[PDB]
Structures are given as structure tokens and as C-alpha cells.
Amino acid sequence: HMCLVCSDEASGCHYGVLTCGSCKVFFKRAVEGQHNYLCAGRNDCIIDKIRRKNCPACRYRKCLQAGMNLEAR
Amino acid sequence: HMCLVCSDEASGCHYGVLTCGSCKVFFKRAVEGQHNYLCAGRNDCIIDKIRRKNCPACRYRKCLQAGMNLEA
């Protein structure tokens, strides 16, 4: 299938969730770092393969929403 | 000293409009090179100092309609 956050081609199941590799490192980066991002829209940006980069705020919300956590295993 | 695009550090009329330096470069790059910018919202994103990075579609649109143009 495709990633459950961004719809790119998934690379397997990471931090609990079928994601592609990019969202994997992105989530890892967001959780261990700061993630104080601001949405420039209405906190419901569409996170597809190109737009992934537009809004880290919504991208991270979606990661959370889909269930990602560092302690999956 | 308020940029007509990202309402930031306004530094004189670039490409026909009072703009910051970062919006200066962005515009020439947007028109010159080819990328594809698509809005992830509603084609009305908030383009301010922190958030201008988030949506180049909307930033680019705000540029064009604030009068911006090269070979001015």
C-alpha cells in the first residue's frame, strides 16, 4: 500500500504505522526535536507527496492521528 | 518598512514592489525556474514571516497580485 499519512509508497510499518520512509524519519525528527510548527491554513492541510513539505504542523498531526509512537515495540 | 507580501523586513521596491530580501529572491526563482507549487489548503494561506515558507503557491500568488514583475 501507501503511507497512511502522506500516500507516497509505504516502505513497511514504522512506529506502529504503515508509512513511507520519509514520514518515518519526519515523525522521528518531530518527536525527538521541537515540532513547534504553525499551520498557514486551517489545520487541515492535504498531506500528499508534494504537499508533505508545505505543512509540517498538519503532517505531524496526521502522524499522531494515525497512531505513531516511538515505543511501538 | 512592512513588506507587501510577507509583511516583514521591507527593503525598497524589488521587481516593482516594496518587499523583503527573502521575497525578492523567491520571486525571481519562482518565475525563472520551474517548480510545481500546489496549495494544500484553500488557495488563501496566511503568508507572514514565519509561515511564508509553508506555501509557495500562495506566496507566489500574493507576489504576482501585489504588482511584482521582473524586467520591471
Next chain:
DNA sequence: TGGAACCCAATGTTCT
């Protein structure tokens, strides 16, 4: 599967 370390794309600066 999880993470390191490359590598790269875009932005924003300074300097001319």
C-alpha cells in the same frame, strides 16, 4: 523494523 549518515532541495543571508 529503527537509526545513522549521506545527499539534496529550497530559503534567506550577505556581499558586489
Next chain:
DNA sequence: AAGAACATTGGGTTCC
């Protein structure tokens, strides 16, 4: 004013 040229940040891929 315009633009060459850095520097940097954030992102995404590669691990004969």
C-alpha cells in the same frame, strides 16, 4: 535597485 554567492534548515534516501 538586481543578482552572484555564499550558508543553513529541513527533508528524504542509502546503507558493496
